[PDB]
Design a protein around this motif. Structure first.
Motif, PDB file in Angstrom:
ATOM      1  N   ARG A  42      -1.195  -2.568   7.052  1.00 50.05           N
ATOM      2  CA  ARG A  42      -1.019  -1.181   6.679  1.00 50.05           C
ATOM      3  C   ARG A  42       0.222  -0.575   7.313  1.00 50.05           C
ATOM      4  O   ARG A  42       1.205  -0.270   6.641  1.00 50.05           O
ATOM      5  CB  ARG A  42      -2.253  -0.396   7.101  1.00 50.05           C
ATOM      6  N   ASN A  43       0.167  -0.400   8.622  1.00 48.62           N
ATOM      7  CA  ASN A  43       1.279   0.176   9.335  1.00 48.62           C
ATOM      8  C   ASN A  43       2.544  -0.559   8.977  1.00 48.62           C
ATOM      9  O   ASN A  43       3.624   0.018   9.017  1.00 48.62           O
ATOM     10  CB  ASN A  43       1.017   0.113  10.825  1.00 48.62           C
ATOM     11  N   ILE A  46       3.728   1.160   5.844  1.00 44.97           N
ATOM     12  CA  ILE A  46       4.256   2.434   6.287  1.00 44.97           C
ATOM     13  C   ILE A  46       5.665   2.293   6.839  1.00 44.97           C
ATOM     14  O   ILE A  46       6.607   2.878   6.314  1.00 44.97           O
ATOM     15  CB  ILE A  46       3.372   3.061   7.390  1.00 44.97           C
ATOM     16  N   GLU A  47       5.807   1.509   7.897  1.00 42.50           N
ATOM     17  CA  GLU A  47       7.107   1.342   8.514  1.00 42.50           C
ATOM     18  C   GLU A  47       8.152   0.862   7.534  1.00 42.50           C
ATOM     19  O   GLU A  47       9.320   1.231   7.643  1.00 42.50           O
ATOM     20  CB  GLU A  47       7.029   0.367   9.675  1.00 42.50           C
ATOM     21  N   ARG A  49       8.133   1.401   4.141  1.00 42.17           N
ATOM     22  CA  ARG A  49       8.420   2.538   3.268  1.00 42.17           C
ATOM     23  C   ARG A  49       9.207   3.596   4.023  1.00 42.17           C
ATOM     24  O   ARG A  49      10.134   4.208   3.494  1.00 42.17           O
ATOM     25  CB  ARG A  49       7.117   3.137   2.737  1.00 42.17           C
ATOM     26  N   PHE A  50       8.822   3.803   5.270  1.00 40.25           N
ATOM     27  CA  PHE A  50       9.491   4.767   6.109  1.00 40.25           C
ATOM     28  C   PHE A  50      10.961   4.397   6.156  1.00 40.25           C
ATOM     29  O   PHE A  50      11.828   5.259   6.053  1.00 40.25           O
ATOM     30  CB  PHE A  50       8.904   4.718   7.513  1.00 40.25           C
TER      31      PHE A  50
ATOM     32  N   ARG B  42       3.209   3.379  19.082  1.00 46.41           N
ATOM     33  CA  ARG B  42       4.408   3.367  18.268  1.00 46.41           C
ATOM     34  C   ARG B  42       4.112   3.702  16.815  1.00 46.41           C
ATOM     35  O   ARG B  42       4.479   4.760  16.307  1.00 46.41           O
ATOM     36  CB  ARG B  42       5.057   1.995  18.360  1.00 46.41           C
ATOM     37  N   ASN B  43       3.436   2.788  16.146  1.00 47.07           N
ATOM     38  CA  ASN B  43       3.107   2.992  14.759  1.00 47.07           C
ATOM     39  C   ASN B  43       2.451   4.333  14.591  1.00 47.07           C
ATOM     40  O   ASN B  43       2.550   4.936  13.533  1.00 47.07           O
ATOM     41  CB  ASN B  43       2.204   1.880  14.279  1.00 47.07           C
ATOM     42  N   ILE B  46       5.346   6.714  14.186  1.00 49.09           N
ATOM     43  CA  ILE B  46       5.854   6.472  12.849  1.00 49.09           C
ATOM     44  C   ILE B  46       5.016   7.185  11.806  1.00 49.09           C
ATOM     45  O   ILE B  46       5.510   8.054  11.094  1.00 49.09           O
ATOM     46  CB  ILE B  46       5.864   4.965  12.506  1.00 49.09           C
ATOM     47  N   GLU B  47       3.743   6.827  11.723  1.00 50.75           N
ATOM     48  CA  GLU B  47       2.874   7.432  10.732  1.00 50.75           C
ATOM     49  C   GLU B  47       2.852   8.942  10.821  1.00 50.75           C
ATOM     50  O   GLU B  47       2.724   9.625   9.809  1.00 50.75           O
ATOM     51  CB  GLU B  47       1.457   6.903  10.861  1.00 50.75           C
ATOM     52  N   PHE B  50       6.242  10.071   9.578  1.00 49.76           N
ATOM     53  CA  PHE B  50       6.237   9.769   8.164  1.00 49.76           C
ATOM     54  C   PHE B  50       5.532  10.905   7.451  1.00 49.76           C
ATOM     55  O   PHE B  50       5.983  11.373   6.414  1.00 49.76           O
ATOM     56  CB  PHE B  50       5.481   8.466   7.925  1.00 49.76           C
TER      57      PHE B  50
END
Ligand SMILES: [Zn+2]
Ligand SMILES: [Zn+2]
Ligand SMILES: [Zn+2]
Ligand SMILES: [Zn+2]
Lengths: 60, 60
Positions: A42-43, A46-47, A49-50, B42-43, B46-47, B50
């Motif tokens: 998942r993450n 995200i990362e 796409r981010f 970290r993530n 980000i999330e 985001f």
DNA sequence: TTGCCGGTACCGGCA
DNA sequence: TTGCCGGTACCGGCA
């Protein structure tokens, strides 16, 4: 069945607040329609796409 | 010292390719100036960042 | 500044 | 359509 938290960690759950949710003292929900989240992957999405975003900012 | 991978998992490292990097068969680098990444937190950042983005898209 | 223990968090599969 | 073992990935701390 399995409590939300145990389902997530895919751990043996003793309910039907479960034991594990004890050592953690958290909301032991029973959402028969809940399906764990694949955090890692998942993450990762995200990362990823981010990232695209920045390469878009550097172009607008 | 510790190999990059072991430092990340903070696992005992037997180098100075290390053992662990074996069971994993990965590039056992020795970057004396490497510091693990706190994946989780970290993530999380980000999330979170985001997210702000979308609440910005829904406003521009 | 940096190594690792002891202890969860996560998950690939296999029922 | 799920419960969970067996095996890593991650880390809070304590040196
Ligand atoms: Zn449970
Ligand atoms: Zn529970
Ligand atoms: Zn190592
Ligand atoms: Zn190594």
């Amino acid at each position: 069945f399995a409590c939300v938290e145990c389902r997530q960690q895919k751990s043996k759950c003793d309910a039907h607040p479960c034991t594990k949710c004890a050592k953690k003292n958290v909301p032991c929900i029973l959402k028969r329609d809940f399906r764990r989240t694949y955090k890692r992957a998942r993450n990762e999405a995200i990362e990823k796409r981010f990232k695209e975003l920045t390469r878009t900012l550097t172009n607008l």
